[PDB]
Amino acid sequence: SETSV
Amino acid sequence: YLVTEEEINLTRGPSGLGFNIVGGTDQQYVSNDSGIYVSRIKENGAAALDGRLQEGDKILSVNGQDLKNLLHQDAVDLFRNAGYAVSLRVQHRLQVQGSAYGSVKAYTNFDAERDALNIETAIKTKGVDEVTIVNILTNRSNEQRQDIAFAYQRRTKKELASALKSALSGHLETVILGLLKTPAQYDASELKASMKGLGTDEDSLIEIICSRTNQELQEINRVYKEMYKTDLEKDIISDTSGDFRKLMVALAKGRRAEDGSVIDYELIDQDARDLYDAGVKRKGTDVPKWISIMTERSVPHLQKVFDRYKSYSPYDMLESIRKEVKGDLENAFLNLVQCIQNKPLYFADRLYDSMKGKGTRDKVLIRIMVSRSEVDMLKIRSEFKRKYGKSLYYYIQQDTKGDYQKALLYLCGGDD
Ligand SMILES: [Ca+2]
Ligand SMILES: [Ca+2]
Ligand SMILES: [Ca+2]
Ligand SMILES: [Ca+2]
Ligand SMILES: [Ca+2]
């Protein structure tokens, strides 16, 4: 769901 | 909910831009929102350095490519297949609540249908979970509560309120139901409650009618007309008498002069002279001239009038009221002047009175916590602590118990 960018 | 769009120019940090993203058509953050939103901004990353970006923004474009209706993965890919020089279009989405000085704020990660569902769980539960009901209702804004009720109606065909009316009881029930009612409904209800006795809850009627503004009163007056098929003005007349009636009916019109631009210093002096002349300077009192000045003039004007009154009168306005009138009329005047001078202090004194002694005047306590939590509760707590030396939270804690206590404590907002 959360995604580091 | 103010929306402003903006571009931001980021040079990729060591391992990335320095934030996390959530959302997508297949991963809706809130119901029916495919938007891509920043969730975390890295501690000491390039995104924090440029600032601008804020935990909550909506990403609409990456290097000119739009983020409307994408699966999570396609939005991630646009970021990972970008250069080291990244410009994005963000929409900052600040939301501001009615007053800055209310205690209950609109919850930032709001989802109407989700909330409605957990409430159904807490109702559809053996023993019912009174705690989770409180935990969401007292932390949702009144308008958020409306949307909860609407979604509840949809998912059950029964409405929220009459399911809580069966699943709650005691003082706790009163609070929850009161929070379910719009500010006009709740005031209209307490008002209908006041007069439906023939002897009439003067002290409550005085409280609402002395403290509501034009905007609030006109809203009450209309909704009152809709709920009970009477003009509120008509009920006031039918349950009061004398100059009390004149004072109450004049206030309830919600037709006070709105705060103009220029300060009318000449009229301030004239009004001060007339309050002195009509009262302590004269044998007896000209009540009607008091009623006209105190109902017709704007609040800032009257505050200034009361100070100018001290230039002429050896007593101040409250002290002049106590020495000229008695009974309900005295009561109404003291309450009206307190509301004009310091409304938050007014409420802090009523709260202390409702708890100071044996037992609890629960109707006054509940009413204030419900009706002022989104208006000026923070100013009320500040005046309470300054005067009484301990917090509002503390008195609520010492006088009330159970889930009812924790509900009042939430509407309070916290300790001081
Ligand atoms: Ca139980
Ligand atoms: Ca005079
Ligand atoms: Ca007199
Ligand atoms: Ca004026
Ligand atoms: Ca008490």
Side-chain angles (χ1 to χ4, degrees), chain A, chain B residues 1 3-31 33-41 43-53 55-59 61-67 69-90 92-93 95-108 110-123 125 127-149 151-157 159-164 166-195 197-233 235-282 284-416:
Chain A
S1 282
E2 311 134 291
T3 302
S4 43
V5 153
Chain B
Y1 252 105
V3 169
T4 86
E5 308 186 0
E6 191 192 1
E7 84 160 9
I8 299 175
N9 319 321
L10 295 177
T11 302
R12 210 222 278 129
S15 71
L17 291 185
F19 59 101
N20 277 46
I21 50 165
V22 298
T25 69
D26 66 307
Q27 251 175 57
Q28 267 145 14
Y29 203 47
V30 47
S31 320
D33 203 321
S34 316
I36 307 304
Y37 294 88
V38 317
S39 63
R40 273 81 89 224
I41 314 199
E43 311 84 32
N44 253 315
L49 300 192
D50 183 276
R52 311 198 242 165
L53 201 58
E55 313 224 336
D57 281 80
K58 177 194 292 224
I59 317 292
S61 83
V62 189
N63 280 344
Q65 323 143 81
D66 276 19
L67 255 53
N69 304 80
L70 299 167
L71 287 104
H72 192 51
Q73 188 65 38
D74 315 324
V76 170
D77 286 355
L78 290 187
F79 276 103
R80 296 198 169 143
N81 296 330
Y84 52 88
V86 197
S87 278
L88 40 68
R89 210 186 244 285
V90 289
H92 305 261
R93 304 212 322 167
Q95 61 161 0
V96 153
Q97 302 69 352
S99 196
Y101 303 102
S103 59
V104 169
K105 311 291 212 204
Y107 183 67
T108 40
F110 181 50
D111 199 343
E113 275 96 23
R114 183 147 341 260
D115 281 343
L117 183 69
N118 317 58
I119 311 196
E120 153 153 281
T121 319
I123 298 132
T125 279
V128 310
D129 187 11
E130 317 87 356
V131 159
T132 48
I133 288 162
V134 168
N135 276 0
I136 315 147
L137 292 178
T138 59
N139 188 358
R140 294 321 179 264
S141 147
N142 186 275
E143 308 78 321
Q144 297 190 327
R145 283 180 226 131
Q146 300 322 300
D147 296 346
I148 277 43
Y152 203 84
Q153 167 44 271
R154 234 161 81 181
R155 194 165 322 210
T156 69
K157 303 233 70 201
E159 44 211 2
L160 186 55
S162 210
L164 303 166
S166 296
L168 297 169
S169 36
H171 286 324
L172 174 48
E173 201 184 340
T174 317
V175 177
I176 292 307
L177 297 178
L179 302 173
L180 292 176
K181 273 190 261 264
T182 63
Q185 281 165 26
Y186 187 57
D187 282 357
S189 98
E190 306 285 334
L191 281 171
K192 188 65 157 207
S194 181
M195 289 158 321
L198 173 141
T200 69
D201 191 359
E202 294 96 356
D203 159 39
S204 288
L205 180 83
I206 288 172
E207 182 194 297
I208 301 155
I209 306 290
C210 288
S211 66
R212 265 43 156 180
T213 73
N214 288 337
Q215 307 93 271
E216 301 165 337
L217 277 160
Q218 284 193 331
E219 195 76 49
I220 291 153
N221 270 283
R222 160 208 161 222
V223 156
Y224 201 102
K225 173 96 161 205
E226 321 211 297
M227 283 169 91
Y228 313 112
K229 312 272 145 257
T230 325
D231 269 320
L232 155 77
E233 166 153 352
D235 289 337
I236 289 200
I237 292 163
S238 306
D239 277 275
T240 70
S241 76
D243 303 333
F244 183 59
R245 176 216 280 299
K246 293 154 113 144
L247 185 43
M248 306 291 316
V249 86
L251 290 160
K253 279 152 188 147
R255 297 287 290 311
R256 172 190 306 279
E258 293 277 44
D259 179 35
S261 299
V262 78
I263 299 158
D264 195 342
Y265 289 104
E266 164 164 12
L267 182 56
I268 281 140
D269 179 75
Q270 180 176 320
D271 287 328
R273 285 192 76 108
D274 292 350
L275 293 165
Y276 185 58
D277 169 17
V280 303
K281 193 180 176 184
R282 142 191 312 170
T285 323
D286 185 3
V287 176
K289 172 128 264 139
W290 275 20
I291 300 180
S292 312
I293 295 175
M294 301 210 212
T295 55
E296 281 166 9
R297 304 274 189 288
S298 93
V299 164
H301 178 93
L302 282 168
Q303 292 176 331
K304 290 190 201 68
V305 166
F306 297 153
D307 183 39
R308 181 58 180 163
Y309 181 73
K310 299 207 262 166
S311 194
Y312 289 104
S313 166
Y315 323 100
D316 69 4
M317 192 54 70
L318 289 160
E319 202 177 356
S320 300
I321 291 153
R322 303 180 181 109
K323 315 183 13 177
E324 293 268 321
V325 290
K326 245 298 215 181
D328 281 329
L329 192 66
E330 195 201 37
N331 216 37
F333 271 123
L334 299 169
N335 282 246
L336 177 52
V337 167
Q338 278 168 109
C339 289
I340 287 172
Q341 295 177 326
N342 188 337
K343 207 177 293 172
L345 178 60
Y346 172 75
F347 283 116
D349 286 337
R350 296 212 50 138
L351 287 158
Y352 180 74
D353 283 340
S354 87
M355 288 171 286
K356 60 176 184 198
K358 197 210 207 73
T360 311
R361 282 315 112 211
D362 290 275
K363 268 330 301 198
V364 182
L365 171 63
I366 291 163
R367 181 171 49 238
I368 297 178
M369 297 319 290
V370 170
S371 73
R372 305 308 287 188
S373 62
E374 290 183 71
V375 187
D376 52 356
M377 185 61 64
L378 298 180
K379 288 164 138 193
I380 295 168
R381 289 161 46 181
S382 154
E383 305 273 9
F384 194 95
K385 175 76 177 344
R386 191 188 320 159
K387 181 166 170 179
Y388 301 103
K390 262 141 169 190
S391 56
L392 175 60
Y393 177 106
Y394 168 89
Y395 274 83
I396 297 176
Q397 204 186 49
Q398 304 318 133
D399 270 33
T400 69
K401 293 125 271 165
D403 301 315
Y404 168 55
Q405 181 203 89
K406 287 81 163 145
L408 294 178
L409 293 178
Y410 290 152
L411 298 174
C412 178
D415 212 305
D416 304 281

PDB file of all heavy atoms in Angstrom, chain B residues 360-377:
ATOM      1  N   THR B 360     -24.839  16.615  40.056  1.00  0.00           N
ATOM      2  CA  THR B 360     -24.464  17.277  38.807  1.00  0.00           C
ATOM      3  C   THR B 360     -25.702  17.758  38.075  1.00  0.00           C
ATOM      4  O   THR B 360     -26.603  16.961  37.820  1.00  0.00           O
ATOM      5  CB  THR B 360     -23.704  16.319  37.893  1.00  0.00           C
ATOM      6  OG1 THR B 360     -22.662  15.686  38.638  1.00  0.00           O
ATOM      7  CG2 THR B 360     -23.101  17.055  36.709  1.00  0.00           C
ATOM      8  N   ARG B 361     -25.744  19.031  37.694  1.00  0.00           N
ATOM      9  CA  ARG B 361     -26.842  19.448  36.824  1.00  0.00           C
ATOM     10  C   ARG B 361     -26.482  19.028  35.399  1.00  0.00           C
ATOM     11  O   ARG B 361     -25.953  19.791  34.580  1.00  0.00           O
ATOM     12  CB  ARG B 361     -27.136  20.934  36.950  1.00  0.00           C
ATOM     13  CG  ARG B 361     -27.949  21.238  38.223  1.00  0.00           C
ATOM     14  CD  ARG B 361     -29.145  20.231  38.444  1.00  0.00           C
ATOM     15  NE  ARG B 361     -28.992  19.330  39.602  1.00  0.00           N
ATOM     16  CZ  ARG B 361     -29.481  18.090  39.679  1.00  0.00           C
ATOM     17  NH1 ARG B 361     -30.150  17.557  38.656  1.00  0.00           N
ATOM     18  NH2 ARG B 361     -29.275  17.371  40.778  1.00  0.00           N
ATOM     19  N   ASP B 362     -26.810  17.768  35.119  1.00  0.00           N
ATOM     20  CA  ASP B 362     -26.331  17.111  33.919  1.00  0.00           C
ATOM     21  C   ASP B 362     -26.839  17.781  32.655  1.00  0.00           C
ATOM     22  O   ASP B 362     -26.109  17.832  31.656  1.00  0.00           O
ATOM     23  CB  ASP B 362     -26.717  15.631  33.931  1.00  0.00           C
ATOM     24  CG  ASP B 362     -25.947  14.836  34.976  1.00  0.00           C
ATOM     25  OD1 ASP B 362     -24.819  14.386  34.678  1.00  0.00           O
ATOM     26  OD2 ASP B 362     -26.485  14.647  36.100  1.00  0.00           O
ATOM     27  N   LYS B 363     -28.057  18.324  32.668  1.00  0.00           N
ATOM     28  CA  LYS B 363     -28.553  18.940  31.447  1.00  0.00           C
ATOM     29  C   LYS B 363     -27.713  20.144  31.046  1.00  0.00           C
ATOM     30  O   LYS B 363     -27.435  20.345  29.858  1.00  0.00           O
ATOM     31  CB  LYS B 363     -30.019  19.330  31.583  1.00  0.00           C
ATOM     32  CG  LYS B 363     -30.989  18.216  31.111  1.00  0.00           C
ATOM     33  CD  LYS B 363     -30.379  17.328  29.973  1.00  0.00           C
ATOM     34  CE  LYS B 363     -29.986  18.181  28.690  1.00  0.00           C
ATOM     35  NZ  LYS B 363     -29.800  17.390  27.426  1.00  0.00           N
ATOM     36  N   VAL B 364     -27.261  20.938  32.010  1.00  0.00           N
ATOM     37  CA  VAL B 364     -26.477  22.104  31.644  1.00  0.00           C
ATOM     38  C   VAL B 364     -25.089  21.690  31.199  1.00  0.00           C
ATOM     39  O   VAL B 364     -24.513  22.276  30.271  1.00  0.00           O
ATOM     40  CB  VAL B 364     -26.433  23.093  32.810  1.00  0.00           C
ATOM     41  CG1 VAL B 364     -25.658  24.306  32.397  1.00  0.00           C
ATOM     42  CG2 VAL B 364     -27.870  23.450  33.234  1.00  0.00           C
ATOM     43  N   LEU B 365     -24.533  20.663  31.836  1.00  0.00           N
ATOM     44  CA  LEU B 365     -23.195  20.202  31.481  1.00  0.00           C
ATOM     45  C   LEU B 365     -23.165  19.642  30.059  1.00  0.00           C
ATOM     46  O   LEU B 365     -22.404  20.114  29.202  1.00  0.00           O
ATOM     47  CB  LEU B 365     -22.757  19.152  32.493  1.00  0.00           C
ATOM     48  CG  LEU B 365     -21.472  18.410  32.175  1.00  0.00           C
ATOM     49  CD1 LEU B 365     -20.273  19.355  32.126  1.00  0.00           C
ATOM     50  CD2 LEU B 365     -21.283  17.347  33.225  1.00  0.00           C
ATOM     51  N   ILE B 366     -24.003  18.626  29.798  1.00  0.00           N
ATOM     52  CA  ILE B 366     -24.109  18.010  28.477  1.00  0.00           C
ATOM     53  C   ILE B 366     -24.327  19.069  27.398  1.00  0.00           C
ATOM     54  O   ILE B 366     -23.598  19.126  26.394  1.00  0.00           O
ATOM     55  CB  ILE B 366     -25.254  16.978  28.480  1.00  0.00           C
ATOM     56  CG1 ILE B 366     -24.901  15.770  29.333  1.00  0.00           C
ATOM     57  CG2 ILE B 366     -25.657  16.556  27.059  1.00  0.00           C
ATOM     58  CD1 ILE B 366     -26.070  14.988  29.664  1.00  0.00           C
ATOM     59  N   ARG B 367     -25.358  19.905  27.583  1.00  0.00           N
ATOM     60  CA  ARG B 367     -25.695  20.925  26.592  1.00  0.00           C
ATOM     61  C   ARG B 367     -24.486  21.775  26.221  1.00  0.00           C
ATOM     62  O   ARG B 367     -24.256  22.061  25.041  1.00  0.00           O
ATOM     63  CB  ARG B 367     -26.825  21.825  27.095  1.00  0.00           C
ATOM     64  CG  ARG B 367     -27.200  22.877  26.062  1.00  0.00           C
ATOM     65  CD  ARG B 367     -28.457  23.664  26.395  1.00  0.00           C
ATOM     66  NE  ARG B 367     -28.500  24.190  27.751  1.00  0.00           N
ATOM     67  CZ  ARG B 367     -29.465  23.900  28.616  1.00  0.00           C
ATOM     68  NH1 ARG B 367     -30.433  23.055  28.274  1.00  0.00           N
ATOM     69  NH2 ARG B 367     -29.454  24.434  29.827  1.00  0.00           N
ATOM     70  N   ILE B 368     -23.717  22.213  27.217  1.00  0.00           N
ATOM     71  CA  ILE B 368     -22.595  23.091  26.915  1.00  0.00           C
ATOM     72  C   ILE B 368     -21.499  22.322  26.190  1.00  0.00           C
ATOM     73  O   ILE B 368     -20.959  22.785  25.175  1.00  0.00           O
ATOM     74  CB  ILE B 368     -22.072  23.750  28.200  1.00  0.00           C
ATOM     75  CG1 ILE B 368     -23.162  24.649  28.822  1.00  0.00           C
ATOM     76  CG2 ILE B 368     -20.774  24.485  27.909  1.00  0.00           C
ATOM     77  CD1 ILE B 368     -22.768  25.325  30.159  1.00  0.00           C
ATOM     78  N   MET B 369     -21.155  21.138  26.693  1.00  0.00           N
ATOM     79  CA  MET B 369     -20.136  20.333  26.036  1.00  0.00           C
ATOM     80  C   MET B 369     -20.511  20.033  24.580  1.00  0.00           C
ATOM     81  O   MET B 369     -19.651  20.069  23.688  1.00  0.00           O
ATOM     82  CB  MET B 369     -19.921  19.041  26.822  1.00  0.00           C
ATOM     83  CG  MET B 369     -19.398  19.203  28.205  1.00  0.00           C
ATOM     84  SD  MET B 369     -18.118  20.460  28.331  1.00  0.00           S
ATOM     85  CE  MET B 369     -16.743  19.696  27.460  1.00  0.00           C
ATOM     86  N   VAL B 370     -21.790  19.742  24.313  1.00  0.00           N
ATOM     87  CA  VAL B 370     -22.189  19.452  22.940  1.00  0.00           C
ATOM     88  C   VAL B 370     -22.171  20.728  22.088  1.00  0.00           C
ATOM     89  O   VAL B 370     -21.527  20.787  21.025  1.00  0.00           O
ATOM     90  CB  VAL B 370     -23.564  18.765  22.909  1.00  0.00           C
ATOM     91  CG1 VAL B 370     -24.090  18.693  21.478  1.00  0.00           C
ATOM     92  CG2 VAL B 370     -23.478  17.358  23.485  1.00  0.00           C
ATOM     93  N   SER B 371     -22.846  21.775  22.558  1.00  0.00           N
ATOM     94  CA  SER B 371     -23.105  22.951  21.740  1.00  0.00           C
ATOM     95  C   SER B 371     -21.929  23.907  21.649  1.00  0.00           C
ATOM     96  O   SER B 371     -21.970  24.811  20.815  1.00  0.00           O
ATOM     97  CB  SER B 371     -24.290  23.736  22.288  1.00  0.00           C
ATOM     98  OG  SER B 371     -23.904  24.399  23.477  1.00  0.00           O
ATOM     99  N   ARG B 372     -20.908  23.770  22.487  1.00  0.00           N
ATOM    100  CA  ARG B 372     -19.771  24.673  22.415  1.00  0.00           C
ATOM    101  C   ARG B 372     -18.493  23.970  21.992  1.00  0.00           C
ATOM    102  O   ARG B 372     -17.487  24.639  21.757  1.00  0.00           O
ATOM    103  CB  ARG B 372     -19.565  25.379  23.758  1.00  0.00           C
ATOM    104  CG  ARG B 372     -20.804  26.144  24.289  1.00  0.00           C
ATOM    105  CD  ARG B 372     -21.380  27.100  23.241  1.00  0.00           C
ATOM    106  NE  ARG B 372     -20.542  28.276  23.047  1.00  0.00           N
ATOM    107  CZ  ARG B 372     -20.882  29.338  22.318  1.00  0.00           C
ATOM    108  NH1 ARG B 372     -22.056  29.357  21.688  1.00  0.00           N
ATOM    109  NH2 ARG B 372     -20.046  30.378  22.215  1.00  0.00           N
ATOM    110  N   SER B 373     -18.509  22.640  21.869  1.00  0.00           N
ATOM    111  CA  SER B 373     -17.296  21.918  21.488  1.00  0.00           C
ATOM    112  C   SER B 373     -16.753  22.343  20.125  1.00  0.00           C
ATOM    113  O   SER B 373     -15.541  22.273  19.904  1.00  0.00           O
ATOM    114  CB  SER B 373     -17.555  20.420  21.468  1.00  0.00           C
ATOM    115  OG  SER B 373     -18.528  20.153  20.495  1.00  0.00           O
ATOM    116  N   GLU B 374     -17.606  22.760  19.190  1.00  0.00           N
ATOM    117  CA  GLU B 374     -17.112  23.223  17.899  1.00  0.00           C
ATOM    118  C   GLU B 374     -17.142  24.745  17.768  1.00  0.00           C
ATOM    119  O   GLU B 374     -16.865  25.279  16.689  1.00  0.00           O
ATOM    120  CB  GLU B 374     -17.874  22.544  16.748  1.00  0.00           C
ATOM    121  CG  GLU B 374     -17.496  21.055  16.649  1.00  0.00           C
ATOM    122  CD  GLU B 374     -18.135  20.275  15.499  1.00  0.00           C
ATOM    123  OE1 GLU B 374     -17.751  20.503  14.319  1.00  0.00           O
ATOM    124  OE2 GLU B 374     -18.985  19.388  15.780  1.00  0.00           O
ATOM    125  N   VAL B 375     -17.422  25.459  18.849  1.00  0.00           N
ATOM    126  CA  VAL B 375     -17.444  26.912  18.795  1.00  0.00           C
ATOM    127  C   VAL B 375     -16.268  27.489  19.565  1.00  0.00           C
ATOM    128  O   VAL B 375     -15.352  28.058  18.974  1.00  0.00           O
ATOM    129  CB  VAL B 375     -18.770  27.467  19.337  1.00  0.00           C
ATOM    130  CG1 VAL B 375     -18.837  28.956  19.101  1.00  0.00           C
ATOM    131  CG2 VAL B 375     -19.927  26.758  18.670  1.00  0.00           C
ATOM    132  N   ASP B 376     -16.278  27.365  20.885  1.00  0.00           N
ATOM    133  CA  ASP B 376     -15.298  28.131  21.638  1.00  0.00           C
ATOM    134  C   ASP B 376     -14.805  27.358  22.857  1.00  0.00           C
ATOM    135  O   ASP B 376     -14.266  27.947  23.800  1.00  0.00           O
ATOM    136  CB  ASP B 376     -15.878  29.500  22.017  1.00  0.00           C
ATOM    137  CG  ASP B 376     -17.225  29.392  22.703  1.00  0.00           C
ATOM    138  OD1 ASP B 376     -17.752  28.279  22.815  1.00  0.00           O
ATOM    139  OD2 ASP B 376     -17.770  30.428  23.128  1.00  0.00           O
ATOM    140  N   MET B 377     -14.945  26.035  22.824  1.00  0.00           N
ATOM    141  CA  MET B 377     -14.540  25.198  23.948  1.00  0.00           C
ATOM    142  C   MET B 377     -13.121  25.515  24.434  1.00  0.00           C
ATOM    143  O   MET B 377     -12.893  25.573  25.651  1.00  0.00           O
ATOM    144  CB  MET B 377     -14.654  23.719  23.573  1.00  0.00           C
ATOM    145  CG  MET B 377     -14.348  22.818  24.745  1.00  0.00           C
ATOM    146  SD  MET B 377     -15.530  23.133  26.093  1.00  0.00           S
ATOM    147  CE  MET B 377     -17.058  22.619  25.311  1.00  0.00           C
TER     148      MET B 377
END
